[PDB]
Amino acid sequence: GSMAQAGEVVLKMKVEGMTCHSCTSTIEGKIGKLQGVQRIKVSLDNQEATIVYQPHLISVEEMKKQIEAMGFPAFVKKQPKYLK
């Protein structure tokens, strides 16, 4: 069936702890509350979020854009426009 990311998608984005995790407790429950999500993991320090989700509800990447907007920049892998 799914050769790799067909039935689902995976985005291991690597956050920046801002200064020293100014919050991130809220981010725990934020990421865990994302709909259409299958698996859900969040690392320490750089809070490298590794969430698996089905590709037709929402993009966890957009959800992490909020994490970056509040002050936790993320070194997202998915950079198609930048890639050639």
Side-chain angles (χ1 to χ4, degrees):
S2 298
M3 58 180 271
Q5 282 62 71
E8 57 65 48
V9 285
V10 310
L11 302 177
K12 182 165 74 294
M13 297 179 264
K14 183 179 295 302
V15 149
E16 178 188 281
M18 178 138 41
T19 52
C20 180
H21 296 248
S22 304
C23 297
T24 69
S25 300
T26 56
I27 296 184
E28 195 182 274
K30 171 184 171 61
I31 296 177
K33 185 161 67 291
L34 300 185
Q35 300 302 276
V37 168
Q38 312 316 123
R39 193 64 55 77
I40 186 286
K41 301 292 171 293
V42 180
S43 187
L44 296 304
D45 303 90
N46 298 82
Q47 190 185 246
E48 182 178 55
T50 304
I51 295 77
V52 180
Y53 61 103
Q54 69 202 279
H56 61 266
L57 272 304
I58 182 169
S59 57
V60 176
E61 190 164 287
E62 179 49 69
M63 299 296 88
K64 287 206 71 181
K65 184 178 182 298
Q66 318 305 98
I67 293 181
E68 298 171 77
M70 80 114 96
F72 291 116
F75 314 128
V76 177
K77 304 182 301 185
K78 182 177 180 181
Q79 302 298 131
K81 67 296 185 61
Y82 181 82
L83 180 63
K84 189 290 187 180

Coordinates of all heavy atoms in Angstrom, one line a residue:
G1 N 0.9 -1.2 0.0 CA 0.0 0.0 0.0 C 0.9 1.2 0.0 O 1.4 1.6 -1.0
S2 N 1.0 1.9 1.2 CA 1.8 3.1 1.3 C 3.3 2.7 1.2 O 3.9 2.1 2.1 CB 1.5 3.8 2.6 OG 0.2 4.1 2.6
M3 N 4.0 3.1 0.1 CA 5.4 2.8 -0.1 C 6.3 3.5 1.0 O 7.3 3.0 1.4 CB 5.8 3.4 -1.5 CG 5.5 4.9 -1.6 SD 6.0 5.6 -3.2 CE 7.7 6.1 -2.8
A4 N 5.8 4.6 1.5 CA 6.5 5.4 2.5 C 5.5 6.4 3.1 O 4.7 6.0 4.0 CB 7.7 6.1 1.9
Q5 N 5.5 7.6 2.6 CA 4.5 8.7 3.1 C 3.4 8.9 2.0 O 3.4 9.8 1.3 CB 5.3 10.0 3.3 CG 6.1 9.9 4.7 CD 7.1 8.8 4.7 OE1 8.1 8.8 4.0 NE2 6.9 7.7 5.4
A6 N 2.4 8.0 2.1 CA 1.3 8.0 1.2 C 0.0 8.1 2.1 O -0.8 9.0 2.0 CB 1.3 6.8 0.3
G7 N -0.1 7.1 2.9 CA -1.3 7.0 3.9 C -1.1 8.0 5.0 O -2.0 8.4 5.6
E8 N 0.2 8.4 5.1 CA 0.5 9.4 6.2 C 1.8 10.2 5.7 O 2.4 9.9 4.7 CB 0.8 8.7 7.5 CG 1.9 7.6 7.4 CD 3.3 8.1 7.1 OE1 3.6 9.0 7.8 OE2 3.9 7.6 6.2
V9 N 2.2 11.2 6.5 CA 3.4 12.0 6.3 C 4.1 12.2 7.6 O 3.5 12.2 8.7 CB 2.9 13.4 5.7 CG1 2.5 13.2 4.2 CG2 1.7 13.9 6.5
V10 N 5.4 12.5 7.5 CA 6.3 12.7 8.7 C 7.2 13.9 8.5 O 7.9 14.1 7.6 CB 7.2 11.4 8.9 CG1 6.3 10.1 8.9 CG2 8.3 11.3 7.9
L11 N 7.1 14.8 9.5 CA 7.9 16.1 9.5 C 8.7 16.3 10.8 O 8.2 16.8 11.8 CB 7.0 17.3 9.3 CG 6.2 17.1 8.0 CD1 5.2 18.3 7.9 CD2 7.1 17.2 6.7
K12 N 9.9 15.9 10.8 CA 10.8 16.0 12.0 C 11.4 17.4 11.9 O 12.5 17.6 11.4 CB 11.9 14.9 12.0 CG 12.7 15.1 13.2 CD 13.6 13.8 13.5 CE 14.8 13.7 12.5 NZ 14.3 13.5 11.1
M13 N 10.7 18.3 12.5 CA 11.1 19.8 12.5 C 11.9 19.9 13.8 O 11.5 19.4 14.8 CB 9.9 20.6 12.5 CG 9.1 20.4 11.2 SD 7.6 21.3 10.9 CE 6.4 20.1 11.4
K14 N 13.0 20.7 13.7 CA 13.8 21.0 14.9 C 13.8 22.4 15.4 O 14.4 23.3 14.9 CB 15.3 20.6 14.5 CG 16.2 20.8 15.8 CD 17.7 20.4 15.4 CE 17.8 18.9 15.1 NZ 17.3 18.1 16.2
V15 N 13.0 22.6 16.4 CA 12.8 23.9 17.1 C 14.0 24.5 17.7 O 15.0 23.8 17.9 CB 11.6 23.7 18.1 CG1 11.7 24.6 19.3 CG2 10.3 24.1 17.4
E16 N 13.9 25.7 18.1 CA 15.0 26.5 18.8 C 14.3 26.7 20.1 O 13.2 27.1 20.2 CB 15.2 27.8 18.0 CG 16.3 28.6 18.8 CD 16.3 30.1 18.2 OE1 16.9 30.2 17.1 OE2 15.8 30.9 18.8
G17 N 15.1 26.4 21.2 CA 14.5 26.6 22.6 C 14.3 28.1 23.0 O 14.2 28.4 24.2
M18 N 14.4 29.0 22.0 CA 14.2 30.5 22.2 C 15.3 31.0 23.1 O 16.3 31.6 22.6 CB 12.8 30.8 22.9 CG 12.6 32.3 23.1 SD 11.0 33.0 22.8 CE 9.9 31.7 23.4
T19 N 15.2 30.8 24.4 CA 16.2 31.3 25.3 C 16.5 30.1 26.3 O 17.7 29.8 26.6 CB 15.7 32.5 26.1 OG1 14.4 32.1 26.6 CG2 15.4 33.7 25.1
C20 N 15.5 29.5 26.8 CA 15.5 28.4 27.8 C 14.1 27.9 28.0 O 13.7 27.8 29.1 CB 16.2 28.9 29.1 SG 16.4 27.7 30.5
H21 N 13.4 27.6 26.9 CA 12.0 27.0 27.0 C 11.2 28.0 27.8 O 10.7 27.7 28.9 CB 12.0 25.6 27.6 CG 12.8 24.6 26.7 ND1 12.3 23.7 26.1 CD2 14.2 24.6 26.5 CE1 13.2 23.0 25.4 NE2 14.4 23.5 25.7
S22 N 11.0 29.2 27.2 CA 10.1 30.2 27.9 C 8.7 29.7 28.3 O 8.1 30.2 29.2 CB 10.0 31.4 26.9 OG 11.3 31.8 26.6
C23 N 8.3 28.7 27.5 CA 7.0 28.1 27.8 C 7.1 26.6 27.5 O 7.3 25.8 28.4 CB 5.9 28.8 26.9 SG 5.6 30.5 27.2
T24 N 6.9 26.2 26.2 CA 6.9 24.8 25.7 C 6.0 23.8 26.4 O 5.8 22.7 25.9 CB 8.3 24.3 25.7 OG1 8.8 24.1 27.0 CG2 9.3 25.3 25.0
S25 N 5.4 24.1 27.5 CA 4.6 23.2 28.3 C 3.2 23.3 27.5 O 2.6 22.3 27.3 CB 4.4 23.7 29.7 OG 5.7 23.8 30.2
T26 N 3.0 24.5 27.1 CA 1.7 24.7 26.3 C 1.9 24.1 24.9 O 0.9 23.6 24.3 CB 1.6 26.3 26.1 OG1 2.8 26.7 25.5 CG2 1.5 27.0 27.5
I27 N 3.1 24.0 24.4 CA 3.4 23.4 23.1 C 3.2 21.9 23.2 O 2.8 21.3 22.2 CB 4.9 23.7 22.7 CG1 5.0 25.3 22.6 CG2 5.3 23.0 21.5 CD1 6.4 25.7 22.1
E28 N 3.4 21.3 24.3 CA 3.3 19.9 24.5 C 1.8 19.5 24.2 O 1.6 18.7 23.3 CB 3.6 19.6 26.0 CG 3.7 18.1 26.2 CD 4.0 17.8 27.7 OE1 5.2 17.8 28.1 OE2 3.0 17.4 28.3
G29 N 0.9 20.1 24.9 CA -0.5 19.9 24.7 C -1.1 20.4 23.4 O -2.1 20.0 22.9
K30 N -0.3 21.4 22.8 CA -0.7 22.0 21.5 C -0.6 21.0 20.4 O -1.5 20.7 19.6 CB 0.2 23.2 21.3 CG 0.0 23.8 19.8 CD 1.0 25.0 19.6 CE 1.0 25.4 18.2 NZ -0.4 25.9 17.8
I31 N 0.6 20.5 20.4 CA 1.0 19.4 19.3 C 0.2 18.1 19.5 O -0.1 17.5 18.6 CB 2.6 19.2 19.5 CG1 3.3 20.5 19.2 CG2 3.0 18.1 18.5 CD1 4.9 20.4 19.4
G32 N -0.1 17.8 20.8 CA -0.8 16.6 21.1 C -2.3 16.7 20.8 O -3.0 15.8 20.7
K33 N -2.7 18.0 20.6 CA -4.2 18.3 20.3 C -4.4 18.5 18.8 O -5.5 18.8 18.4 CB -4.5 19.6 21.2 CG -6.0 20.0 21.0 CD -6.4 20.9 22.2 CE -5.7 22.3 22.1 NZ -4.2 22.2 22.4
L34 N -3.4 18.3 18.0 CA -3.5 18.5 16.6 C -4.4 17.4 16.0 O -4.1 16.2 16.2 CB -2.1 18.6 16.0 CG -1.3 19.7 16.5 CD1 0.1 19.8 15.8 CD2 -2.0 21.1 16.4
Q35 N -5.4 17.7 15.2 CA -6.2 16.7 14.6 C -5.6 16.1 13.4 O -4.7 16.6 12.8 CB -7.6 17.4 14.2 CG -8.3 17.9 15.5 CD -8.5 16.8 16.5 OE1 -9.5 16.1 16.5 NE2 -7.6 16.7 17.5
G36 N -6.1 14.9 13.1 CA -5.7 14.1 11.9 C -4.3 13.6 12.2 O -3.6 13.1 11.2
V37 N -3.9 13.6 13.4 CA -2.5 13.2 13.8 C -2.6 11.7 14.2 O -3.4 11.3 15.0 CB -2.0 14.1 14.9 CG1 -0.8 13.5 15.6 CG2 -1.6 15.4 14.3
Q38 N -1.6 11.0 13.7 CA -1.5 9.5 14.0 C -0.5 9.4 15.2 O -0.9 9.2 16.3 CB -1.0 8.7 12.8 CG -1.7 9.1 11.5 CD -3.2 9.2 11.8 OE1 -3.9 10.2 11.6 NE2 -3.8 8.1 12.2
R39 N 0.7 9.5 14.9 CA 1.8 9.4 16.0 C 2.1 10.9 16.4 O 1.9 11.8 15.6 CB 3.0 8.7 15.4 CG 4.1 8.3 16.5 CD 3.5 7.3 17.5 NE 3.0 6.1 16.7 CZ 3.8 5.2 16.2 NH1 5.1 5.3 16.4 NH2 3.3 4.2 15.5
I40 N 2.7 11.0 17.5 CA 3.1 12.4 18.0 C 4.2 12.3 19.0 O 4.0 11.7 20.1 CB 1.8 13.1 18.5 CG1 1.9 14.6 18.9 CG2 1.1 12.3 19.7 CD1 2.7 14.8 20.2
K41 N 5.3 13.0 18.7 CA 6.5 13.0 19.6 C 7.1 14.4 19.6 O 7.0 15.1 18.6 CB 7.5 11.9 19.1 CG 6.9 10.5 19.1 CD 6.6 10.0 20.5 CE 5.8 8.7 20.4 NZ 4.4 9.0 19.9
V42 N 7.7 14.7 20.7 CA 8.4 16.0 20.9 C 9.7 15.8 21.6 O 9.7 15.3 22.7 CB 7.4 17.0 21.6 CG1 8.1 18.4 21.8 CG2 6.1 17.2 20.9
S43 N 10.8 16.2 21.0 CA 12.1 16.1 21.7 C 12.4 17.2 22.8 O 11.5 18.0 23.0 CB 13.2 16.1 20.6 OG 14.4 15.8 21.2
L44 N 13.5 17.1 23.4 CA 13.9 18.0 24.4 C 14.9 19.1 23.8 O 15.3 18.9 22.7 CB 14.6 17.3 25.6 CG 13.7 16.2 26.3 CD1 12.5 16.9 26.9 CD2 13.3 15.0 25.5
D45 N 15.2 20.1 24.6 CA 16.2 21.2 24.2 C 15.7 21.9 22.9 O 15.0 22.9 23.0 CB 17.6 20.5 23.9 CG 18.0 19.8 25.2 OD1 17.7 18.7 25.3 OD2 18.7 20.5 26.0
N46 N 16.0 21.3 21.8 CA 15.6 22.0 20.5 C 14.1 21.6 20.1 O 13.7 21.8 19.0 CB 16.5 21.5 19.3 CG 17.9 21.9 19.6 OD1 18.7 21.3 20.4 ND2 18.4 23.0 19.0
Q47 N 13.5 21.0 21.1 CA 12.0 20.5 20.9 C 11.8 20.0 19.5 O 10.8 20.5 18.9 CB 11.2 21.7 21.4 CG 9.7 21.3 21.5 CD 8.8 22.5 21.8 OE1 8.3 22.7 22.8 NE2 8.7 23.5 20.9
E48 N 12.6 19.2 19.1 CA 12.5 18.6 17.7 C 11.2 17.8 17.7 O 11.2 16.6 18.0 CB 13.7 17.7 17.4 CG 13.6 17.2 15.9 CD 14.9 16.4 15.5 OE1 15.2 15.5 16.3 OE2 15.4 16.7 14.5
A49 N 10.2 18.4 17.2 CA 8.9 17.8 17.1 C 8.8 16.8 15.9 O 9.2 17.2 14.8 CB 7.8 18.9 16.9
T50 N 8.4 15.6 16.2 CA 8.4 14.5 15.2 C 6.9 13.9 15.3 O 6.7 13.0 16.0 CB 9.4 13.4 15.5 OG1 10.6 14.1 15.6 CG2 9.6 12.4 14.4
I51 N 6.1 14.6 14.5 CA 4.6 14.1 14.5 C 4.3 13.5 13.1 O 4.7 14.0 12.1 CB 3.7 15.4 14.7 CG1 3.9 16.0 16.1 CG2 2.2 15.0 14.6 CD1 5.2 16.8 16.2
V52 N 3.5 12.4 13.2 CA 3.1 11.7 12.0 C 1.6 12.0 11.9 O 0.9 12.0 12.9 CB 3.3 10.2 12.2 CG1 2.8 9.5 11.0 CG2 4.8 9.9 12.5
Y53 N 1.1 12.3 10.7 CA -0.3 12.6 10.5 C -0.8 12.2 9.1 O 0.0 12.1 8.2 CB -0.5 14.1 10.8 CG 0.3 15.0 9.8 CD1 -0.4 15.7 8.8 CD2 1.6 15.3 10.0 CE1 0.3 16.5 8.0 CE2 2.3 16.1 9.2 CZ 1.7 16.7 8.2 OH 2.3 17.6 7.3
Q54 N -2.0 12.0 9.0 CA -2.6 11.6 7.7 C -2.8 12.9 6.8 O -3.1 14.0 7.3 CB -4.0 11.0 7.9 CG -5.0 12.0 8.4 CD -6.1 11.4 9.2 OE1 -7.1 10.8 8.6 NE2 -6.1 11.4 10.5
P55 N -2.5 12.8 5.5 CA -2.2 14.0 4.6 C -3.5 14.7 4.1 O -3.5 15.1 3.0 CB -1.4 13.4 3.5 CG -1.7 11.9 3.4 CD -2.5 11.6 4.7
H56 N -4.5 14.8 4.9 CA -5.8 15.5 4.4 C -6.6 16.2 5.5 O -7.8 16.5 5.2 CB -6.6 14.4 3.7 CG -7.0 13.3 4.6 ND1 -6.4 12.2 4.8 CD2 -8.1 13.2 5.4 CE1 -7.0 11.4 5.6 NE2 -8.1 12.0 6.1
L57 N -6.1 16.5 6.6 CA -6.8 17.2 7.7 C -6.1 18.6 7.9 O -6.7 19.6 7.8 CB -6.7 16.4 9.1 CG -7.9 15.4 9.3 CD1 -9.3 16.0 9.1 CD2 -7.7 14.3 8.3
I58 N -4.8 18.5 8.3 CA -4.0 19.7 8.5 C -2.5 19.4 8.5 O -2.1 18.3 8.7 CB -4.5 20.4 9.8 CG1 -3.7 21.7 10.1 CG2 -4.2 19.4 11.0 CD1 -4.3 22.5 11.3
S59 N -1.7 20.5 8.3 CA -0.3 20.3 8.3 C 0.3 20.8 9.7 O 0.1 21.9 10.1 CB 0.3 21.3 7.2 OG -0.2 22.6 7.5
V60 N 1.0 19.8 10.3 CA 1.6 20.1 11.6 C 2.6 21.2 11.5 O 3.0 21.8 12.4 CB 2.2 18.8 12.1 CG1 2.9 19.0 13.5 CG2 1.0 17.7 12.3
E61 N 3.1 21.3 10.2 CA 4.1 22.4 9.9 C 3.5 23.7 10.2 O 4.2 24.6 10.7 CB 4.5 22.1 8.5 CG 5.8 23.0 8.2 CD 6.4 22.5 6.9 OE1 7.0 21.4 7.0 OE2 6.3 23.2 5.9
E62 N 2.3 23.9 9.8 CA 1.6 25.2 10.0 C 1.4 25.4 11.5 O 1.6 26.5 12.0 CB 0.2 25.1 9.3 CG -0.6 26.4 9.5 CD 0.2 27.7 9.1 OE1 0.5 27.8 7.9 OE2 0.5 28.4 10.0
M63 N 1.1 24.3 12.2 CA 1.0 24.4 13.6 C 2.3 24.8 14.3 O 2.3 25.4 15.3 CB 0.5 23.0 14.1 CG -0.9 22.7 13.4 SD -2.3 23.7 13.9 CE -2.1 25.0 12.6
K64 N 3.4 24.4 13.7 CA 4.7 24.7 14.2 C 5.1 26.1 13.8 O 6.0 26.7 14.4 CB 5.8 23.7 13.7 CG 5.6 22.4 14.4 CD 7.0 21.6 14.4 CE 7.9 22.3 15.5 NZ 9.2 21.5 15.5
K65 N 4.4 26.7 12.8 CA 4.7 28.0 12.4 C 4.3 29.0 13.5 O 4.9 30.0 13.7 CB 3.9 28.3 11.1 CG 4.3 29.7 10.5 CD 3.5 29.9 9.2 CE 3.9 31.2 8.6 NZ 3.5 32.4 9.5
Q66 N 3.3 28.5 14.2 CA 2.8 29.3 15.4 C 3.8 29.2 16.5 O 4.1 30.2 17.2 CB 1.5 28.7 15.8 CG 0.6 28.3 14.6 CD 0.4 29.4 13.7 OE1 1.0 29.6 12.7 NE2 -0.6 30.3 14.0
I67 N 4.4 28.1 16.6 CA 5.5 27.9 17.7 C 6.7 28.8 17.4 O 7.3 29.3 18.2 CB 5.9 26.4 17.6 CG1 4.7 25.5 18.1 CG2 7.2 26.1 18.4 CD1 5.1 24.0 18.0
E68 N 6.9 29.0 16.1 CA 8.0 29.9 15.6 C 7.6 31.3 15.7 O 8.4 32.2 15.8 CB 8.3 29.5 14.2 CG 8.8 28.0 14.1 CD 8.9 27.6 12.7 OE1 9.9 28.0 12.0 OE2 8.0 26.8 12.3
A69 N 6.3 31.6 15.6 CA 5.7 33.0 15.7 C 5.8 33.5 17.1 O 6.1 34.7 17.3 CB 4.3 32.9 15.2
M70 N 5.6 32.6 18.0 CA 5.6 33.0 19.5 C 7.0 33.2 20.0 O 7.2 33.8 21.0 CB 4.8 31.9 20.2 CG 5.7 30.6 20.5 SD 6.1 30.3 22.2 CE 4.7 29.1 22.5
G71 N 8.0 32.7 19.2 CA 9.4 32.8 19.6 C 10.3 31.6 19.6 O 11.4 31.6 20.1
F72 N 9.8 30.5 19.0 CA 10.6 29.2 18.9 C 10.9 28.8 17.5 O 10.3 27.9 17.0 CB 9.9 28.1 19.7 CG 9.8 28.2 21.2 CD1 8.5 28.4 21.8 CD2 10.9 28.2 22.0 CE1 8.4 28.5 23.1 CE2 10.8 28.3 23.3 CZ 9.6 28.5 23.9
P73 N 11.8 29.5 16.8 CA 12.1 29.2 15.4 C 12.4 27.7 15.2 O 13.1 27.1 16.0 CB 13.3 30.1 15.0 CG 13.5 31.1 16.2 CD 12.6 30.7 17.3
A74 N 11.9 27.2 14.1 CA 12.2 25.7 13.8 C 12.8 25.5 12.4 O 12.5 26.1 11.4 CB 10.8 25.0 13.8
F75 N 13.8 24.7 12.5 CA 14.7 24.3 11.3 C 13.9 23.2 10.6 O 14.3 22.0 10.7 CB 16.1 23.9 11.9 CG 16.6 24.9 12.9 CD1 17.0 24.5 14.2 CD2 16.6 26.3 12.7 CE1 17.4 25.4 15.1 CE2 17.0 27.2 13.6 CZ 17.4 26.7 14.8
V76 N 12.9 23.6 9.9 CA 12.0 22.6 9.2 C 12.8 22.0 8.0 O 13.6 22.7 7.3 CB 10.8 23.4 8.6 CG1 9.9 22.5 7.8 CG2 10.0 23.9 9.8
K77 N 12.6 20.7 7.8 CA 13.3 19.9 6.7 C 12.7 20.3 5.4 O 13.3 20.6 4.4 CB 13.2 18.4 7.0 CG 13.8 18.1 8.4 CD 13.7 16.5 8.6 CE 12.3 16.0 8.5 NZ 12.2 14.6 8.8
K78 N 11.4 20.2 5.4 CA 10.5 20.5 4.2 C 10.7 21.9 3.7 O 10.1 22.8 4.2 CB 9.1 20.2 4.6 CG 8.1 20.4 3.4 CD 6.7 20.1 3.8 CE 5.7 20.3 2.6 NZ 4.3 20.0 3.0
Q79 N 11.6 22.0 2.7 CA 12.0 23.3 2.1 C 12.0 23.1 0.6 O 13.1 23.3 0.0 CB 13.3 23.8 2.7 CG 13.3 24.0 4.2 CD 12.3 25.0 4.7 OE1 11.5 24.8 5.6 NE2 12.2 26.2 4.1
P80 N 10.9 22.8 0.0 CA 10.9 22.4 -1.5 C 11.3 23.5 -2.4 O 12.2 23.4 -3.2 CB 9.4 22.0 -1.7 CG 8.6 22.5 -0.5 CD 9.6 22.8 0.6
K81 N 10.8 24.7 -2.2 CA 11.1 25.9 -3.0 C 12.6 26.2 -2.9 O 13.2 26.7 -3.8 CB 10.3 27.1 -2.4 CG 10.7 27.6 -1.0 CD 10.4 26.5 0.1 CE 10.7 27.0 1.5 NZ 9.8 28.2 1.8
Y82 N 13.2 25.9 -1.7 CA 14.6 26.2 -1.5 C 15.4 25.1 -2.2 O 16.5 25.3 -2.7 CB 14.9 26.2 0.0 CG 16.4 26.5 0.3 CD1 16.9 27.8 0.3 CD2 17.2 25.5 0.6 CE1 18.2 28.0 0.5 CE2 18.6 25.7 0.8 CZ 19.1 27.0 0.8 OH 20.4 27.2 1.1
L83 N 14.9 23.9 -2.2 CA 15.5 22.7 -2.8 C 15.4 22.7 -4.3 O 14.5 23.3 -4.8 CB 14.9 21.4 -2.2 CG 15.5 20.1 -2.8 CD1 17.0 20.0 -2.4 CD2 14.7 18.9 -2.2
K84 N 16.4 22.1 -5.0 CA 16.4 22.1 -6.5 C 16.7 20.6 -6.8 O 17.8 20.2 -6.5 CB 17.5 23.1 -7.0 CG 17.4 23.3 -8.5 CD 17.9 22.0 -9.3 CE 18.0 22.4 -10.8 NZ 18.5 21.2 -11.5

